[PDB]
Ligand binder design. Structure first.
Ligand SMILES: [K+]
Ligand SMILES: [K+]
Ligand SMILES: [K+]
Ligand SMILES: [K+]
Ligand SMILES: [K+]
Ligand SMILES: [K+]
Ligand SMILES: [K+]
Ligand SMILES: [K+]
Ligand SMILES: [K+]
Ligand SMILES: [K+]
Ligand SMILES: [K+]
Ligand SMILES: [Mg+2]
Ligand SMILES: [Mg+2]
Length: 1338
RNA sequence: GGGGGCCACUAGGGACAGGAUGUUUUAGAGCUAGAAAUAGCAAGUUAAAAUAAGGCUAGUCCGUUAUCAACUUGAAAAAGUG
DNA sequence: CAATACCAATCCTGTCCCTAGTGGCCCC
DNA sequence: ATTGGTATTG
């Protein structure tokens, strides 16, 4: 008994099928367990497992880290209160108690209800003097009076609880004075430089224009307006842009050929300026210097909207400005609405449900929505012009706690905090003694390289301690070993050397590593001149001379430099041919040049004695990012360099690690030669062996030592192995499920293994936010104004043509012309490399053009003429990252010969041969599970051949022989895909056994193109209908003579298999996990649905959550008390155990149930019922548990094959294509069988009346179908497709028939399944335990 | 076919440290005329505290991923059953 | 019981590791 | 986008 297995692996399904040698699907009797009539059941060996998607770990991470942050913010407040504890006890022994219980209703409060002062008079007076906390903050900063300790606490607590970002390094002492004087100084330095060309800045209010309430770029254009001439892209224009955004490339300004863009915020600035001034002269230094001198006073013009000369609390002052302008404008607006539109005043100022001022303060209206609601009301009235100005600046009636405060650096809150402490430490000594500790509470962050401050019970932590004591913000430096922790941060994540698994990998920017890469590439170079008989390698002396002359003097080495600066100057060659490198060398000694610029001592870098030192230095600059730690580590070499050099060295940081260790590159030595790998790369006679040759040469010690160093260790489990594969958790779920299905199938077949296993894996399948970001970055990098003229929202960028329009700066890609948005319907979306070769539908292969004809010829890449015309525009788009390097290269391919015949052959092969790593891992898993025995030569015995196919094989097979697929009809198509996979794969390797190299796991261009294009012709009776050819009726193997395909019987076999109505569709039952409930914190309500957010927070007083998620339901057979007498009454019901309740219910089920009300629970009749638990009722009707109180449809509609194929054809599903005569034949079949439509609706109808039970919906559907009987056949079929939403397995859903919408009929009761048959199914559904639940009751 | 190093991109996975809102209850004395219902007017911008219930291992830690038919012997982890 | 209508926390900064898809140089 | 919870209406 021989058989094969077909598998179809998806993100929500695994289809499976068992076939015999005749491509038939067997059917068996399977034993049935339980307590019913039925002892056994017939099952066809074909089906599909269905499951909800595996989820990434991301959401879990976001919640975990937010959790740690709430914990630590509470701890900050706790530190501050502990510092205040005793003196506050002297002032008010319950103040902190009133703060802690502020949330409590007065009934539940232990202390007086007014938090700050504990009496209504003082509290009301406080709020009258300080309407916002920023009033009190500014007062405590500016005043000199002794202040109440509770108000000092509140100011400091508010600063520490909402402390601002940490994105700017160092100290920040704001000063907005001299802004106009600094601008005058910048204009002065520019005019003293270009004495011949001066700018007159007199009268230019740079302070207002630059501290403006609008954007940086608008400020720039306004400022340039005031300078006669001086176009915005002139030198001074870009110098003003310096503080106002990222400056365009000074390339144009200084006649350069390289990019010269700067950004004062970027760390590279100090280098780039030096990189730039060296090109243009140090005399320009002062210029950029004055530029920086302005930016400091204007850096925070957006945050601080008040002069610092009047207050040391400019932030709080700007909030108070918000408050005062809100007050004045609200007074004015109220008066205006009273005068002009009284009939609306209420709706504006009282209706919380409208987006007016009421809904803005009290309702749920955001600033944006309030602005949108009130803009027409302001435009409709008179005297609202200033308010409209403030509105369009987004500065009308502002609150103080707003979504855009994320710009505020922590240094500003710190300044205000420090100032309050300095004011009040003169009156309170503990504030003087704890000044720095409180500042430290504000400033301290756990470093990202330290991680959670755990003590052995966190699976996420790696931090190590110098001593064992509680870590505080003030002793962190002494208790945490920051160096060891920062090291572990990297070493727990980075790979070891695969060749020497005990060896750490080198930094990617190590000098030794770059020497290795350069010398590898260099040894494989060859050259020819005239007198030479044969191309020659480079000798050791030649490679050394090339490194010293070129690689050690230029960062990049072009082939042109190699020809002219070495072979011409040293070898006196005028002509030489080079192989092994094209255009320029890929490797390079970049770190060498970095350090040459920093330390300025070539001999130091060339001296081998310093090697270790330099390696260590680069290690330090890679392992660590904190420049104080970098400094501490480099301190050991302080005597070797000047202090200036050490300051420059501190700032030189590197990221990235290599893939080889130092011991491999320049450590282990070949026994007889005594030479390392790098030694051989420098000089290896006339063989010039590279790394691979070196470590594989049986003539050297390297290979043997690598073999010796290897070690496997402890092996993973199947689940662990699958979890560690590189792929989407979605598809890893399907992989594990596939292995389990195969195991069960083998056990079904008497533990005999199959001949073949054919596997196929599906393709690759918020985001509009990313699209908008791409387009914004590109258009700004373009310097284009297409967004200024045609604004767009991210949603619309999901349209392919509009997205392409914006990615192409609104132009044609094949013609140097503009395009019109309003004409997008008339344009074309063309494939760069045609889809007849590469089935790529991504933006990377697509281009928007007026007419695709203008590409050139359609059998290749765009023509040479288009390339000549458009290459510079394409380069522009590439530099804006509006097209990728791959897109640009494919576009320009015609200047490199275009598509060759070998390329087309390879494209066909790629269309047919799978090469994704993940599918190969699935094949390896199955192969290593199936084949375990070795032969007399200790080589593997491959009993089972694992064949992988791409979906195009079976898709083409379906379309060519009319085994059509309609996905919406039911879930059978997964199983049918698996079956067709087994059939086609086994036939394909039976017919061409030599294909086993390509399709089976384990160890002229026209010819392969033709071969692979025609690989599947042995199925057809008549091919190429080139010229026409004919094939026999029976197809056998050429060598063996064995029969592989009988075109008489086997197609009928396939039709019989696809027609079978009994297909094992199993929806995987799963316990629900994740969040307890909806997160929304609802207001108080008289409802038992509400859930307390804290143990003593009665939701009837405090609000809380509702809508918890049921982890699983439970059958309870017990008694409940009834009526006022509490008489015991027997019941049977489903109890939904919620996710939050699960641990308690499982720790003691009986106590849990009795707390819920149940008595005398039959403990052994408790049945755990996860989501999708399957029940059968009458007439085959099935239901699945959706919840404890709702059900899902549980049946599949087995629509006969003739109706499926008729629907596919009549709906023009996908493409017709075909011969014109074959098109006409399919069309004539459609029209000849129009009655099928009614028959289909009859089938559905019958099904719905037996199984769906949605009378109203079925009647609406019948009425709609009878209404649209004169519609075209195509459209009626297209909507009949939609009708199957009514009958689909799973949760009910809404669907449209033409323009009538049918809402979902839900099953809002689970009572009936309590007396139905529960069906437990194995993974394949071939093994069942059926339980008659009607036999359970009191 | 499979595999390695390097260059140029691109797509995804994982961890850590942080920021701004939002919500919820309480505090921010509403007034006047009416018994009242209600009407007219005034006011509004801020704060505290929680932000999965909670847990024990008590850490400035952990709490939403992965994995799960039934039955059996099993504390479990397992293995087995048609 | 129904049928049905509404609802669902959001956005952002930085450090770092890893695999794998496309094209290319050189190899096992 | 789904789809299970919830109140509302009857
Ligand atoms: K101008
Ligand atoms: K609001
Ligand atoms: K190159
Ligand atoms: K680094
Ligand atoms: K020194
Ligand atoms: K789960
Ligand atoms: K889930
Ligand atoms: K936050
Ligand atoms: K199952
Ligand atoms: K992030
Ligand atoms: K590659
Ligand atoms: Mg907590
Ligand atoms: Mg808030």
């Amino acid at each position: 008994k021989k058989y094969s297995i077909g598998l179809a692996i998806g993100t929500n399904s695994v289809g499976w099928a068992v076939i015999t040698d005749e491509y038939k699907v067997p059917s068996k009797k399977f034993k049935v367990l339980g307590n019913t009539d039925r002892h056994s059941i017939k099952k066809n060996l074909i089906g599909a497992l269905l499951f909800d998607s595996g989820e990434t770990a991301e959401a879990t991470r976001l919640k975990r880290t937010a959790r740690r942050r709430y914990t630590r913010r509470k701890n900050r407040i706790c530190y501050l209160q502990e510092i205040f504890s005793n003196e506050m006890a002297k002032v008010d022994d319950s103040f902190f108690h009133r703060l802690e219980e502020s949330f409590l209703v007065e009934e539940d409060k232990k202390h007086e209800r007014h938090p700050i002062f504990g009496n209504i008079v003082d509290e009301v007076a406080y709020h009258e003097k300080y309407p916002t906390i920023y009033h009190l903050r500014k007062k405590l900063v500016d005043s000199t009076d002794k202040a109440d300790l509770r108000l000092i606490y509140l100011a400091l607590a508010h600063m520490i609880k909402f402390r601002g970002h940490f994105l700017i390094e160092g100290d920040l002492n704001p000063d907005n004075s001299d802004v106009d004087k600094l601008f005058i100084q910048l204009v002065q330095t520019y005019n003293q430089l270009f004495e011949e060309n001066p700018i007159n800045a007199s009268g230019v209010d740079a302070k207002a224009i630059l501290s403006a309430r609008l954007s940086k770029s608008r400020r720039l254009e306004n400022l340039i307006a005031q300078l006669p001439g001086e176009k915005k892209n002139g030198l001074f224009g870009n110098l003003i842009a310096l503080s106002l955004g990222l400056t365009p490339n000074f390339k144009s300004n200084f006649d350069l050929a390289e990019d010269a863009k700067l950004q004062l915020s970027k760390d590279t600035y100090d280098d780039d300026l030096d990189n730039l001034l060296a090109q243009i002269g140090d005399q320009y230094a002062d210029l950029f210097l004055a530029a920086k001198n302005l930016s400091d006073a204007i850096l925070l013009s957006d945050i601080l909207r008040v002069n610092t000369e009047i207050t040391k609390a400019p932030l709080s002052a700007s909030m108070i400005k918000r408050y005062d302008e809100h007050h004045q404008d609200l007074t004015l607006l109220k008066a205006l609405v009273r005068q002009q539109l009284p009939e609306k005043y209420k709706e504006i100022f009282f209706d919380q449900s409208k987006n007016g001022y009421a809904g803005y303060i009290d309702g749920g209206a955001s600033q944006e929505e309030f602005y949108k609601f009130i803009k027409p009301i302001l435009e409709k009235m008179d005297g609202t012009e200033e308010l409209l100005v403030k509105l369009n600046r987004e500065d009308l009636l502002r609150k103080q706690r707003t979504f855009d405060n994320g710009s505020i650096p922590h240094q500003i809150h710190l300044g205000e905090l420090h100032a309050i402490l300095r004011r009040q430490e003169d009156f309170y000594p503990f504030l003087k003694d704890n000044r720095e500790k409180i500042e430290k509470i504000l400033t301290f962050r756990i470093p990202y390289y330290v991680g959670p401050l755990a003590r052995g019970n966190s699976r996420f932590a790696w931090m190590t301690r110098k001593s064992e004591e509680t870590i505080t913000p003030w002793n962190f430096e002494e208790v945490v070993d920051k160096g060891a922790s920062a090291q572990s941060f990297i070493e727990r994540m980075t790979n070891f050397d695969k060749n020497l698994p005990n060896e750490k990998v080198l930094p990617k920017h190590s000098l030794l590593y770059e020497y290795f890469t350069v010398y590898n590439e260099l040894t494989k170079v060859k050259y020819v001149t005239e007198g030479m008989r044969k191309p020659a390698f480079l000798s050791g002396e030649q490679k050394k001379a090339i490194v010293d002359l070129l690689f050690k003097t230029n960062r990049k080495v072009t082939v042109k430099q190699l020809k002219e600066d070495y072979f011409k100057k040293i070898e006196c060659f005028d002509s030489v041919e080079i192989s092994g490198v094209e255009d320029r060398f890929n490797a390079s000694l970049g770190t060498y040049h970095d350090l040459l610029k920093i330390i300025k001592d070539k001999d130091f870098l060339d001296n081998e004695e310093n090697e270790d030192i330099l390696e260590d230095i680069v290690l330090t600059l890679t392992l660590f990012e904190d420049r104080e730690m970098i400094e501490e580590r480099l301190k050991t070499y302080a005597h070797l360099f000047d202090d200036k050099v050490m300051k420059q060295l501190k700032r030189r940081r590197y990221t990235g690690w290599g893939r080889l260790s130092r011991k491999l590159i320049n450590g282990i030595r070949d026994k007889q030669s005594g030479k390392t790998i790098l030694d051989f790369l420098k000089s290896d006679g006339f063989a010039n062996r590279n790394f691979m040759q070196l470590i594989h040469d049986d003539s050297l010690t390297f290979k043997e030592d690598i073999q010796k160093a290897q070690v496997s260790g402890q092996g993973d489990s199947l689940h662990e192995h699958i979890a560690n594969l590189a792929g989407s958790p979605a598809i890893k779920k399907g992989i594990l499920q596939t292995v389990k299905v195969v195991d069960e199938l083998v056990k079904v077949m008497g533990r005999h293994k199959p001949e073949n296993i054919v596997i196929e894996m599906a393709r690759e399948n918020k985001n509009s936010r990313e699209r908008m970001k791409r387009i914004e970055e590109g258009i700004k990098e373009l310097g284009s104004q297409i967004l200024k003229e045609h604004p767009v929202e991210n949603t619309q960028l999901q349209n392919e043509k509009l997205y392409l329009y914006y990615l192409q700066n609104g132009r044609d890609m094949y013609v140097d012309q503009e395009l019109d948005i309003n004409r997008l319907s008339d344009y074309d979306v063309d494939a760069i490399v045609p889809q007849s070769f590469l089935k790529d539908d991504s933006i990377d292969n697509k281009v928007l053009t007026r007419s695709d004809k203008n590409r050139g010829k359609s059998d290749n890449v765009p023509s040479e003429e288009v390339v000549k015309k458009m290459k510079n525009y394409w380069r522009q788009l590439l530099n804006a990252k509006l097209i990728t390097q791959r897109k640009f290269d494919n576009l320009t391919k015609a200047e490199r010969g275009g598509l060759s015949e070998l390329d087309k052959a390879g494209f066909i092969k790629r269309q047919l041969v799978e090469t994704r790593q993940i599918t190969k891992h699935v094949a390896q898993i199955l192969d290593s599970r199936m084949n375990t025995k070795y032969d007399e030569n200790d080589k593997l015995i491959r009993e089972v051949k694992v064949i992988t196919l791409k979906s195009k094989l079976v898709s083409d097979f379906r379309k060519d022989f009319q085994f059509y697929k309609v996905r919406e009809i039911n879930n059978y198509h997964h199983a049918h895909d698996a079956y067709l996979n087994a059939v086609v794969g086994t036939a394909l390797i039976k017919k061409y056994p030599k294909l086993e190299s390509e399709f089976v796991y384990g160890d002229k261009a026209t010819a392969k193109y033709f071969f692979y294009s025609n690989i599947m012709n042995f199925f057809k009776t008549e091919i190429t209908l080139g010229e026409i050819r004919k094939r026999p009726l029976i197809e056998t193997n050429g060598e063996t003579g064995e029969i592989v395909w009988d075109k008489g019987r086997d197609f009928a076999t396939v039709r019989k298999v696809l027609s079978m109505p009994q297909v094992n569709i199993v929806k995987k039952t799963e316990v629900q996990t994740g969040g307890f409930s909806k997160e929304s914190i609802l207001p108080k309500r008289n409802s038992d649905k509400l859930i307390a957010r804290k143990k003593d927070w009665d939701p009837k007083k405090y609000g809380g959550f509702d809508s918890p998620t049921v982890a699983y339901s439970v059958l309870v057979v017990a008694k409940v008390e009834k009526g006022k007498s509490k008489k015991l009454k027997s019941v049977k019901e489903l109890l939904g155990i919620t996710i939050m309740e699960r641990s308690s219910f499982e720790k003691n089920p009986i106590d849990f149930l009795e707390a819920k009300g149940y008595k005398e629970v039959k403990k052994d009749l408790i049945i755990k019922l996860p989501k999708y638990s399957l029940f059968e009722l009458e007439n085959g009707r099935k239901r699945m548990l959706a919840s404890a109180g709702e059900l899902q449809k549980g049946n599949e509609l087995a629509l006969p094959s003739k109706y499926v194929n008729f629907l596919y054809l009549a709906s023009h599903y996908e493409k017709l294509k075909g011969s014109p005569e074959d098109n006409e034949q399919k069309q004539l079949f459609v029209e000849q069988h129009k009655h099928y439509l009614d028959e289909i609706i009859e089938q559905i109808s019958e099904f719905s009346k037996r199984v769906i039970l949605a009378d109203a919906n079925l009647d609406k559907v019948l009425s709609a179908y009878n209404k649209h009987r004169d519609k075209p056949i195509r459209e009626q079929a297209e909507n009949i497709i939609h009708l199957f939403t009514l009958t689909n397995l799973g949760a009910p859903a809404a669907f449209k028939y033409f323009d009538t919408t049918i809402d979902r009929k839900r099953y809002t009761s689970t009572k009936e399944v309590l007396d139905a048959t529960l069906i437990h199914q194995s993974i394949t559904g071939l093994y069942e335990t059926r339980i008659d639940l009607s036999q359970l009751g009191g």
